[PDB]
Amino acid sequence: MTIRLVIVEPEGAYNLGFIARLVKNFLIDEFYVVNPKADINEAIKFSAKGSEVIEKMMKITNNFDDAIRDVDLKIATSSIADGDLLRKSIRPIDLERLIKDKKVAFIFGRESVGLTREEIAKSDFLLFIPANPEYPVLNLSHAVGIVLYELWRNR
Amino acid sequence: MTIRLVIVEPEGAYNLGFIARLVKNFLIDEFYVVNPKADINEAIKFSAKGSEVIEKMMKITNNFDDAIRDVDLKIATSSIADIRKSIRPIDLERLIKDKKVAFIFGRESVGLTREEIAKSDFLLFIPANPEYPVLNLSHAVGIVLYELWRN
Numbered sequence A: 001m002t003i004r005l006v007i008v009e010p011e012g013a014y015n016l017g018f019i020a021r022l023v024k025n026f027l028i029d030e031f032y033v034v035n036p037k038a039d040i041n042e043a044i045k046f047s048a049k050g051s052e053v054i055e056k057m058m059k060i061t062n063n064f065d066d067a068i069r070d071v072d073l074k075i076a077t078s079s080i081a082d083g084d085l086l087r088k089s090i091r092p093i094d095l096e097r098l099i100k101d102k103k104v105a106f107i108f109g110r111e112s113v114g115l116t117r118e119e120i121a122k123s124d125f126l127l128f129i130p131a132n133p134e135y136p137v138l139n140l141s142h143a144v145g146i147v148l149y150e151l152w153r154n155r
Numbered sequence B: 001m002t003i004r005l006v007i008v009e010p011e012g013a014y015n016l017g018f019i020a021r022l023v024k025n026f027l028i029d030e031f032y033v034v035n036p037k038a039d040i041n042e043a044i045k046f047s048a049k050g051s052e053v054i055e056k057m058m059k060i061t062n063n064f065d066d067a068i069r070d071v072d073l074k075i076a077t078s079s080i081a082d083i084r085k086s087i088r089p090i091d092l093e094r095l096i097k098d099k100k101v102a103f104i105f106g107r108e109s110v111g112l113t114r115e116e117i118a119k120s121d122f123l124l125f126i127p128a129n130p131e132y133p134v135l136n137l138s139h140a141v142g143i144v145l146y147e148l149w150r151n
């Protein structure tokens, strides 16, 4: 079981840095970032001190397709709890069974607008993190940390 | 029953704002902040719909005792970088059933204080990389709140 974190066009340096820290906290295997908008130099200040996750490990790609090659499963995320989208909808309780023995890309979208409908169409599953139904939209890095933690919660 | 989040001496405006957002995301009942160092005005920029949490809900104290009054259980989060009988977030549901609980998180750049430890009924660690076990404050908060909500 191998985990690739894919962050699509992150906008905030704090988010990018905080995600990089989480990659070390949770021993993520691969860290890909599509066309980052955030200033990488600024992001480094929020990453795990001495870790070089941004500097060395992080792989930048130009487009979505180059970040989702060579995996078994693509799990997109959304703050909207949804047809085709219901059909691919999952929850955190589902993850353990689905990712067993697989190389999985966990894909997160833009702070402004999320993932596009086509990015979701290209993904196998669409994960929603349960939260207040009246305000379920989590900040990007906090969503990432919750998902990564779910890979660790029985330690 | 009811859950009070207690954040001691937060330094980062981003962390404070992010925490306020999470309070709304996960319907935390009470929210206290002890001697904040962060600029609360700047923190609002990071709070999104949690701005109302900062406005109306957030209580500021100048000492720790005042932030942990009138609860049944105090649970402080730390890590092995800082600190047995420690617990994990999956243990929470059994411990807190039918109780008013304060969840205490400390200032980012320092370990739990002796006071915080003395006052705490349980010490909670988030399962993580032993070489890099320290989560950023607001991300630790989000994980714990998430587990409470999941339950």
Ligand SMILES: CSC[C@H]1O[C@@H](n2cnc3c(N)ncnc32)[C@H](O)[C@@H]1O
Pocket: A077, A078, A079, A080, A107, A108, A109, A110, A111, A112, A113, A114, A115, A127, A128, A129, A130, A131, A136, A137, A138, A139, A140, A143
């Ligand atoms: C603020 S939205 C930015 C990104 O965070 C993730 N996200 C935010 N909230 C949630 C949620 N409740 N469930 C799943 N993903 C989320 C999604 O990847 C989204 O594209």
